[PDB]
């Protein structure tokens, strides 16, 4: 009878479709390569049927075979045109079906002949779906072929719109072929790009702090032994120092070093640096004079806020401002005119070394997530415990100041004696704070009735047994992505205590060495994306590039931690040590 040219690159030479056509006494030429007009595969052809053909047809060919080129495409067009349609059908959660349509000059733009709705069960694998569709369309072709040959079907134009996908759009998703529909949608919900409608962060920390001063001005801000400052008192003194600093020429993105012990003067100095416009570099003065000398050299800091006592540990490296000299304080107590943007530096901290750069928007995002998460109110009282050279300090000070809470400085007297500290808290009625895993585990041993919440993380947490009523939370995150990026409420004991779910405006991805996504439950190198990412390492652009990358598929900016982890079925993340 008639000679049929069958085009495919993926499909077998013995498809149900080919056998049916041969059953009807058609000679079926099978071709899997691109062809041109001169091709001997185009001699004496009545119908062209194409099924997963991986090449376009020159206009020359489609015109000569107009009205006689059929394509088998397993999607409910115009949904899911182009490559890997069955997959994108699941991922993009489009309607699912199979379509036989004429071949137009453009990809999958030909008028429809027949169309069928298909269904996938939550339990089917993505390879199950791929087959179930090819099954459905092959059977459909056999049912309606006769109707197609005799030309008795009225082609109808495809509905406007649709989705289109390209060959390489699945690269990022190569490891997901054997995933379940349920398991695949779960992964999307955990790792898919942010939903539309969100706006950049438009505030700096000292903006929001000055905001909070006017709401709770007479509330206690910071306490150190018997001395205390209200938000109003604290704000005005920082302003006086900030005026002085901006007079000395502090400007946005400038570095100002602070070398002091935990004290009211420290909080004033920190806020004064921000309000002036710059970012503060905390230097614990117990560091070896070697480290201190380096931190001041690497840092471009021209100003140093410090004591008469620690003055000499800098060896005249820079201009010094005595926080105890009343001449370092201006008469003006007004808030300074704002000159900062959220992309300006807020602080620079050193890892165990390199200068990590953090911007205001990084810090704002963390505090704005912290307040509502832990339901912090001005009734709360928190401790300044961590060294002021670690990002754990930023949590202690900043989160609670924007909640109107009261900060209590922790002297070395009870820094180590947790029995004595606990007595502090029970007397003063402390309700919340962060303790590193080491210190936190110890504190579980002391009796406590003050706390409402305690937070840990930084090293692996292994014990949960606590005496007090308070809830307990384990967190995770590197200094490079601003304090912590994930948070878990500990409800029951675990052999591996999970580190929780991501915070506001942050996303975490588990990737192959190839940087491809990994199914829920499969380990990989944990990657961070979102508001938390800092500016990088100071004076270390080549190394910054190493750790702050532009993903090859998505083009998003991500931080490579070098930690192993995996997602649990309920959405929480599980730490699995370093990558080695
Ligand atoms: N002329 C024509 N119209 C069609 O509608 C049609 C055909 N040919 N041939 C088979 C199928 C389309 N199949 C495909 C699938 C992918 C590519 C492809 O190579 N896409 C590249 C684009 C890059 C480039 O243009 O070089 C990609 O990266 O996604 C081509 C044809 N098809 C009807 O079903
Ligand atoms: N629950 C946890 N388990 C293991 N490591 C953690 C952790 N929470 C934080 N970290 C570690 O803290 C590091 C950043 O601070 P470090 O001082 O290096 C310890 C992270 O890179 C991460 O390796
Ligand atoms: C100390 C902790 C809050 C910090 N994210 C770290 O791991 O260094």
The pair phi, psi for residue 381, each rounded to 5°, is -135, 130
Atom 6, ligand 1: residue with shortest CA distance: 107
Q: After which residues is the chain broken (C to N over 2.5 A)?
A: 352
Q: Is 458 in the pocket of ligand 3 (CB under 6 A)?
A: yes
> Measured on CA atoms in the order 52, 58, 61, 62, is the torsion positive or negative?
positive
Nearest-CA neighbor of 500 among 576, 575, 577, 573? 573
Nearest-CA neighbor of 533 among 383, 398, 366? 366
Q: Is 104 in the pocket of ligand 1 (CB under 6 A)?
A: yes
d(CA 538, ligand 2 centre) in Å: 21
Return the H-helix or E-strand segment holding 565.
Answer: strand 557-567
DSSP 8-state secondary structure symbol assigned to residue 205: H
Boundaries of domain holding 62? 2-191
Q: How far apart are CA 526 and CA 104, in angstroms?
A: 45
Q: How far apart are CA 122 and CA 117, in angstroms?
A: 17
Q: Is 534 in the pocket of ligand 3 (CB under 6 A)?
A: no
Q: Could you tell me how many helices (H) and strands (E) the chain has, helices first? A: 16, 28
Phi-psi map region of 405: left, alpha, beta (phi>0 left; psi -120 to 50 alpha): beta
d(CA 312, ligand 1 centre) in Å: 73
Atom 19, ligand 1: residue with shortest CA distance: 55
The CATH number of residue 134's host domain is 3.40.50.170
Return the H-helix or E-strand segment holding 3.
Answer: strand 3-7
Query: Which residues fall within 8 angstroms of residue 550, CB to CB, at 6 or more apart?
Result: 556, 557
Instruction: Out of 393, 459, 480, 526, give the residue to mutate to test ligand 2, the one with the largest number of ligand atoms within 8 Å of its CB.
Output: 459
Q: Is 484 in the pocket of ligand 3 (CB under 6 A)?
A: yes
Cross-strand partners of 497: none
Q: Which ligand is nearest to the CA of 52?
A: 1
Q: How far apart are CA 47 and CA 44, in angstroms?
A: 10
Nearest-CA neighbor of 78 among 163, 136, 154? 163
The token pair at 200 is 């950049």
Atom 4, ligand 3: residue with shortest CA distance: 483
Return the H-helix or E-strand segment holding 578.
Answer: strand 573-578
The token pair at 293 is 């000398």
Beta strands in 194-344 (DSSP E): 220-224, 227-230, 255-259, 279-282, 303-306, 319-322
This structure's resolution (Å) is: 2.8
Identify the residue whose tokens are 């179930």: 132
123, burial (CB in 10 Å: exposed 0-12, middle 13-18, buried 19+): exposed
Strands 164-165 and 548-550 come out as unpaired
Helices marked H in 509-558 — which ranges?
541-547
Q: Is 166 in the pocket of ligand 1 (CB under 6 A)?
A: yes
Q: Please give, one letter per residue, the 3-state secondary structure of 64-122.
A: HCCCCEEEEECCCCCCCEECCHHHHHHHCCCCCEEEEEECCCCCCCCCEEEEEECCCCC
Instruction: Out of 398, 484, 532, give the residue to mutate to test ligand 3, the one with the largest number of ligand atoms within 8 Å of its CB.
Output: 484
Identify the residue whose tokens are 């185009």: 42
**CB count in 10 Å sphere of residue 229:** 20
The token pair at 518 is 């990994």
Q: Are 347 and 281 in contact (CB under 8 A)?
A: yes
Nearest-CA neighbor of 241 among 224, 260, 227? 260
Report the Cα 253 to chain-centroid distance in Å. Answer: 25
Q: How many CA atoms lie within 13 A of 439 on its CB side?
A: 21
**CB count in 10 Å sphere of residue 120:** 17
d(CA 292, ligand 2 centre) in Å: 24
Q: Are 479 and 351 in contact (CB under 8 A)?
A: yes
d(CA 71, ligand 1 centre) in Å: 12
Q: How far apart are CA 351 and CA 163, in angstroms?
A: 46
Q: Are 129 and 90 in contact (CB under 8 A)?
A: yes
34, burial (CB in 10 Å: exposed 0-12, middle 13-18, buried 19+): middle
Q: Are 155 and 111 in contact (CB under 8 A)?
A: yes
Cross-strand partners of 524: 565
**CB count in 10 Å sphere of residue 417:** 13
Strands 557-567 and 524-530 come out as antiparallel
Q: How far apart are CA 580 and CA 563, in angstroms?
A: 9
DSSP 8-state secondary structure symbol assigned to residue 414: H
d(CA 137, ligand 1 centre) in Å: 19
Length of the chain: 580
Q: How far apart are CA 524 and CA 527, in angstroms?
A: 9
Please tell me the experimental approach by which this structure was elucidated.
X-ray
Q: Is 575 in the pocket of ligand 2 (CB under 6 A)?
A: yes
Instruction: Out of 476, 499, 534, 547, give the residue to mutate to test ligand 2, the one with the largest number of ligand atoms within 8 Å of its CB.
Output: 476
Q: How far apart are CA 164 and CA 88, in angstroms?
A: 9
Q: How many CA atoms lie within 13 A of 313 on its CB side?
A: 24
Q: How far apart are CA 123 and CA 183, in angstroms?
A: 9
d(CA 337, ligand 3 centre) in Å: 33
Nearest-CA neighbor of 99 among 89, 88, 111? 111
Q: Is 8 in the pocket of ligand 1 (CB under 6 A)?
A: no
Query: Which residues fall within 8 angstroms of residue 471, CB to CB, at 6 or more apart?
Result: 452, 453, 454, 489, 490
Identify the residue whose tokens are 């709360």: 380
Cross-strand partners of 475: 487
């Amino acid at each position: 009878m008639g000679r049929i040219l069958f085009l495919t690159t993926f499909m077998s030479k013995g498809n149900k479709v080919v056998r049916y056509l041969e059953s009807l006494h058609h000679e079926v030429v099978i071709c899997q390569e691109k062809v041109h007009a001169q091709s001997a595969n185009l001699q004496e052809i009545d119908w062209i049927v194409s099924y997963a053909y991986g090449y376009i047809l020159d206009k020359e060919i489609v015109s000569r075979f107009r009205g006689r080129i059929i394509n088998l495409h397993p999607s409910l067009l115009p949904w899911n045109k182009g490559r890997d349609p069955v997959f994108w059908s699941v991922w993009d959660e489009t309607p699912k079906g199979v379509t036989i349509h004429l071949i137009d000059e453009h990809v999958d733009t030909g008028d429809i002949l027949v169309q069928e709705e298909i269904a996938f069960a939550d339990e089917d694998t993505l390879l199950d779906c791929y087959n179930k569709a090819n099954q459905a369309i092959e059977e459909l072709f056999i049912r309606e072929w006769e109707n197609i040959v005799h030309g008795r079907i009225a082609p109808y134009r495809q509905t406007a719109g649709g989705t289109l996908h390209f060959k390489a759009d699945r690269d990022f998703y190569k490891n997901l072929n054997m995933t379940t529909v349920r398991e695949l949608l779960a992964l999307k919900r955990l790792c898919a790009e942010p939903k539309r409608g969100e706006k950049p962060i438009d505030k700096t920390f000292h903006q929001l702090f000055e905001q909070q001063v006017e709401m709770t001005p007479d509330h206690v801000a910071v306490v150190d032994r018997g001395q205390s400052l209200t938000y109003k008192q604290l704000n005005e003194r920082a302003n006086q120092l900030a005026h002085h600093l901006r007079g000395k020429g502090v400007k946005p993105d400038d570095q100002v070093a602070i070398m002091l012990d935990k004290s009211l003067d420290m909080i004033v100095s920190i806020l004064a640096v921000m309000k002036a416009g710059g970012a503060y570099v905390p230097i614990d003065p117990d560091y070896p004079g070697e480290r201190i000398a380096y931190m001041l050299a690497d840092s471009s800091a021209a100003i140093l806020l410090t004591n008469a006592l620690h003055e000499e540990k800098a060896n005249g490296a820079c201009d010094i401002i005595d926080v105890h000299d009343p001449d370092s304080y201006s008469e003006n107590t007004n808030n300074l005119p704002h000159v900062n943007r959220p992309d300006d530096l807020v602080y620079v901290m050193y890892t165990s070394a390199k200068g990590v750069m953090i911007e205001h928007h990084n810090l704002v995002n963390f505090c704005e997530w912290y307040r509502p998460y832990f339901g912090v109110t001005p009734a709360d009282k928190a401790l300044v415990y961590s060294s002021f050279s670690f990002d754990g300090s930023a949590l202690d000070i900043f989160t609670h100041l924007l909640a109107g809470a009261a900060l209590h400085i922790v002297p070395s007297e009870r820094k180590y004696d947790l029995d004595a500290l606990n007595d502090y808290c029970n007397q003063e009625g402390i309700t919340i704070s962060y303790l590193p895993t080491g210190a936190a585990e110890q504190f579980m041993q002391m009796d406590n009735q003050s706390f409402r919440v305690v937070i840990t993380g930084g090293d692996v947490l292994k014990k949960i047994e606590r005496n007090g009523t308070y809830k307990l939370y384990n967190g995770y995150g590197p200094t490079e992505c601003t304090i912590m990026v994930t948070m878990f409420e500990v409800d029951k004991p675990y052999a591996n205590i999970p580190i929780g779910k991501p915070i506001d405006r942050t996303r975490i991805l588990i990737l192959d060495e190839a940087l491809a996504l990994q199914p829920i439950g499969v380990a990989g190198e944990l990657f961070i994306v979102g508001e938390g990412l800092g500016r990088g390492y100071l004076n270390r652009p080549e190394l910054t590039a190493e750790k702050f990358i532009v993903h090859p598929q998505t083009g998003e900016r991500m931080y490579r931690t070098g930690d192993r982890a995996r997602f649990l079925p309920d959405g929480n993340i599980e730490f699995l040590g370093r990558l080695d």
